């Protein structure tokens, strides 16, 4: 059975290197080219390069030559991925993978991936910001830079809830999150009513109540 | 290194035919070269659904076929199922070529559960606050769309922006329909240096923006 | 046409360690696998090993394997030898040659030579010659007579031997040095001479022995028995 | 009966140099084996992963048959697990290769009294072959400061060399036609059988 | 790999043929047309000469061929030359990028007429005795071709223990020179009536013979 079984899950700080692995059984692994992928979140499929184990002949992508060095150990079936330096961008699934055979040329064979997530990770409270109205109209609070999730948004203490929507958050390439939430009111209670967001984060300890008005 | 362009999203009933496209294929008729379709899942591996243009691994539902005609592979997808929602992706491999591998830009395939709806978009400006702090959020929210699937650009003087863009992924709402949330991140300069900025979602073909003005 | 220099060669201790180098004239080093051999004193060339042009593969003859390192530097179009564990069967002239063809090749042969470099591998001190007078034959009258000196127990090597401080060279042969199981060597020098000059004419041999800083001046004079 | 064109591999007018060594796909047919007696008088064979008693009865995804021409004293070097000039330059098979290395003289074809000068072998290599990987490029390597200008001489050297096979050297030296038969095995439905099944 | 079977030496006159045998195992020699050939002149470093068997160089003249025969490949000389006058050694590619060299062959062009030697004995030096050494001292010049045995006796019996001899070496007038030591104590020196050196050459025994008591 042709199998390719890769490292565990890897979250590093910028600036570290890093050295994944790649280990093939099952197969003559001297015999084969293996190939390493990655895959942003979210994002599709990029070829990185191949390496020949027995004899570490490479070819990088144009997009990954000199950004990355794939590696080879025959004595011990595996191959690797390794930077000197990770920036944030290189946070990504890594999959190593094979063709299914001499004469068929396609990646039939998939390594499980491996996670690589690159975070400045330090936890810190978020900036809450109001974002005001221009017969129904629109505000509401953006919650910025905070880790880790969750932040719970409140609105007027909780006594306003038809007609709330608090987003889920994006999670930033700096591995801070920020999120929005947002309240359909009536034209009508525009000036009559007053609005204010209640955001709370409990990891930080913080909470603030920001208000919004045009 | 030439790209391999596939739409971004197609949608069908279940029981429908759909076809994704594949341009720009090369090949070296002196070398070795496949074609080749896999389909991937949240959180699994990709897999091989089509191999060496039109072959199928033991296995693979025939409701999967595919085909080459000049530059340009389809794939095509019979009698649609919920189980095939996934994102596919194109590759062609050519031996002589630099990179010998590539992956097409990928397609997500929805499988229809209920009518199409348009997404709401609400683009806000930047806070007071945040400007007088001196950082810049442009806030695009977009809610209430049927599929989950949709492409957000971002215009400034109809000029198109890349940089500084953060996106999520479609998330469920409480009526089942759909919502997103795109930011873009701008100096103060930046925002008062054009006349206007524009959020611009693209969802099943039809494209609706908001546009916001530094005058208030 | 390419050349190569091998430097580094020098009298060394069993068990110590010795580097040589090969350097290659002009740019084509980096485009060529290269290779060391070496040749005892009197016997056969023995292959040694072998480094690929682009270091991706290196070959030891089992002689040599786990004690000496063959590796190259193309940045300075220089090849290396690191001998460790020296024993006296060392003791040889060590050549670099290069592939008579570019990148990976091997199934050829080695086209271009250096001159090689000597590595005598030897426990023995540094020790100048004891000289001998070889006295020409009382009865030489055969026309001409033979008449030399003996030079005994030095090391290393060389020595070198004229006679009447170079005035005398017509008939003169000076012979190869023998390796005694001391680790001393020795050789002669003689010279043909007519026998009527015996005893009116005076010979010395000057024996230089670098090495050990000494020169000997034997006179060889004639026996009366 | 829709049998596999063994003949258009076995029985071709003319094969290739080994360097740019020819391939023969073989897919959606009946594999009559017992053709290759017709075509090639004399043949010797080995196999491998597979045996050949039992070729008539197997059914595989799809065959590959590799055929050119290379001296008798490198047939040896069209096996799994070999290295030499042919193995390392020119045509490389795995070590888990499964298939059949059929091989013939093909002396009164392929030698000519003055030397068959058509038949060529590449001689250097920036790196080992491949598995199956074919190497037809003919520049000439500058290894010096002159470019080279597709002219062979200092320091500027040409990457292949002819046989010159004639009828006077000894077997060893005689011209040899090779066909390699790769049988290969996917997890995808057989489009190469034998007769009897 | 052991060292690949060569014969000593080979002789033969200009315009003759000469060949020389290189012997090896089924893993090496036998095994693979790897085989290739070197020439070396004195003092200089080798020359290739042949590959694949057969097969020559740029440059190296077409009177130098090859052939093989199961574990055995030759050199071939046709039309031997002055400058042919060299050793030569057979290589052989041995399985895993290993190579292994013969054990060379010396090959003399015969050049001058036969010459037989000159051959003086001196006994131990007053002086090397007065040290308590004693070295019997063998020269033997002006021989062609370069090639002897050298035999020593005391009284009539032969004395292997404490030779050195020294190979054939050019002199300036072309003809060959060696010499042969035999180092004894003055007690063994002084034991015997008599000392021999007898030098063989071409089949034919010149001999010299020296007395502690005469002289
Ligand atoms: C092979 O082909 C030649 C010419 O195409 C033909 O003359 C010969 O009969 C063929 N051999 C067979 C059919 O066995
Ligand atoms: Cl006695
Ligand atoms: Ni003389």
């Not at chain 1, 070829?47 to 004899?55: A, E, H, K, L, V």
């Not at chain 2, 599929?147 to 198109?160: L, M, R």
């Not at chain 4, 050949?52 to 004293?73: E, H, M, Q």
């Amino acid at each position: 059975q042709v199998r390719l079984v890769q490292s565990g899950a890897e979250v590093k700080k910028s600036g570290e290197s890093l050295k994944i692995s790649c280990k093939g059984s099952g197969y003559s692994f001297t015999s084969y080219w293996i190939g390493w992928v990655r895959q942003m979140p979210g994002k599709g499929l990029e070829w990185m390069g191949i390496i020949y184990p027995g004899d570490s002949d490479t070819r990088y992508s144009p997009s990954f030559q000199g950004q990355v060095t794939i590696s080879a150990d025959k004595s011990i079936s595996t191959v690797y991925l390794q930077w000197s330096s990770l920036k944030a961008s290189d946070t990504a699934m890594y999959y190593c993978a094979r063709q299914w055979s001499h004469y068929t040329y396609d990646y039939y064979y998939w390594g499980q991936g491996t996670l690589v997530t690159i975070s400045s990770a330090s936890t810190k409270g978020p900036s809450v910001f109001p974002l005001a109205p221009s017969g129904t109209a629109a505000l509401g609070c953006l919650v910025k830079d905070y880790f880790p999730e969750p932040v719970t948004v409140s609105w007027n203490s909780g006594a306003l809830t038809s007609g709330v929507h608090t987003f889920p958050a994006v999670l930033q390439s700096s591995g801070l999150y920020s999120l929005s939430s947002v309240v359909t009111v009536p034209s009508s209670s525009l000036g009559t009513q007053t609005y204010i967001c209640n955001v709370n984060h409990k990891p930080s300890n913080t909470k603030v109540d920001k208000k919004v008005e045009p | 290194q030439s790209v391999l362009t596939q739409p971004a999203s197609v949608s069908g009933s279940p029981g429908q035919s759909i076809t994704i496209s594949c341009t720009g294929i090369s090949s070296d008729v002196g070398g070795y070269n496949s074609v080749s379709w896999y389909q991937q899942h949240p959180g699994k591996a990709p897999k091989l659904m089509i191999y060496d243009v039109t072959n199928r691994p033991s296995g693979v539902s025939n409701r999967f076929s595919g085909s080459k005609s000049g530059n340009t592979a389809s794939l095509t997808i019979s009698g649609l199922q919920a189980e095939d929602e996934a994102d596919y992706y194109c590759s062609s491999y050519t031996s002589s070529s630099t990179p010998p591998y590539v992956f097409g830009t990928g397609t997500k395939v929805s499988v229809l559960g209920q009518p199409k709806a348009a997404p709401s978009v609400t683009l806000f400006p930047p806070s007071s606050e945040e400007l007088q702090a001196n950082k810049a959020t442009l806030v695009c929210l977009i809610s209430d769309f049927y599929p989950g699937a949709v492409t957000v650009a971002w215009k400034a003087d109809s000029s198109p922006v890349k940089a500084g863009v953060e996106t999520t992924t479609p998330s469920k709402q409480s009526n089942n329909k759909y919502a997103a949330s795109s930011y873009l991140s701008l100096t103060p300069e930046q925002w008062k240096s054009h006349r206007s900025y524009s959020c611009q979602v693209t969802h099943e073909g039809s494209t609706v923006e908001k546009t916001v003005a530094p005058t208030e | 046409e390419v050349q190569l220099v091998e430097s580094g060669g020098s009298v060394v201790q069993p068990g110590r360690a010795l580097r040589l180098s090969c350097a290659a004239s002009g740019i084509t080093f980096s485009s060529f696998g290269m290779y060391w051999v070496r040749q005892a004193p009197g016997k056969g060339l023995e292959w040694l090993g072998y480094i690929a042009y682009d270091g991706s593969d290196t070959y030891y003859a089992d002689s040599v394997k786990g004690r000496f390192t063959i590796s190259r530097d193309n940045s300075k179009n220089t090849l290396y030898l690191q001998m460790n564990s020296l024993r006296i069967e060392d003791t040889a002239v060590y050549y670099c040659a290069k592939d008579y063809y570019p990148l990976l090749s091997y199934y050829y042969g080695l086209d271009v030579w250096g001159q090689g470099t000597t590595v005598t591998v030897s426990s023995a001190s540094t020790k100048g010659p004891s000289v001998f007078p070889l006295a020409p034959s009382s009865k030489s009258s055969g026309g001409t007579a033979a008449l030399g000196c003996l030079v005994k127990d030095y090391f290393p090597e060389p020595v070198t031997v004229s006679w009447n401080s170079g005035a005398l060279t017509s008939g003169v042969h000076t012979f190869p040095a023998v390796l005694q199981s001391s680790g001393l060597y020795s050789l002669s020098s003689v010279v043909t001479v007519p026998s009527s000059s015996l005893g009116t004419q005076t010979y010395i041999c000057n024996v230089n022995h670098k090495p050990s800083n000494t020169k000997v001046d034997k006179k060889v004079e004639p026996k009366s028995c | 009966t829709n049998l596999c064109p063994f003949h258009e591999v076995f029985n071709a007018t003319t094969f290739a140099s080994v360097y740019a060594w020819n391939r023969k796909r073989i897919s959606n047919c009946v594999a009559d084996y017992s053709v290759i007696y017709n075509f090639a008088p004399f043949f010797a064979f080995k196999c491998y992963g597979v045996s050949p008693t039992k070729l008539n009865d197997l059914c595989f995804t799809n065959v590959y048959a590799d055929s050119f021409v290379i001296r008798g004293n490198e047939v040896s070097q069209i096996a799994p697990g070999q290295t030499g000039n042919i193995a390392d330059y020119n045509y490389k098979l795995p070590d888990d290769f499964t298939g059949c290395v059929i091989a013939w003289n093909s002396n009164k074809l392929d030698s000519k009294p003055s030397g068959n000068y058509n038949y060529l072998y590449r001689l250097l290599r920036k790196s080992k072959l491949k598995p199956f990987e074919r190497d037809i490029s003919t520049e000439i390597y500058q290894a010096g400061n002159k470019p080279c200008n597709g002219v062979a001489g200092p320091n500027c050297y040409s990457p292949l060399q002819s046989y010159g096979f004639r009828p006077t050297y000894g077997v060893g030296h005689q011209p040899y036609r090779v066909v390699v038969l790769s049988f290969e095995l996917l997890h995808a439905p057989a489009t190469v059988c034998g007769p009897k099944k």
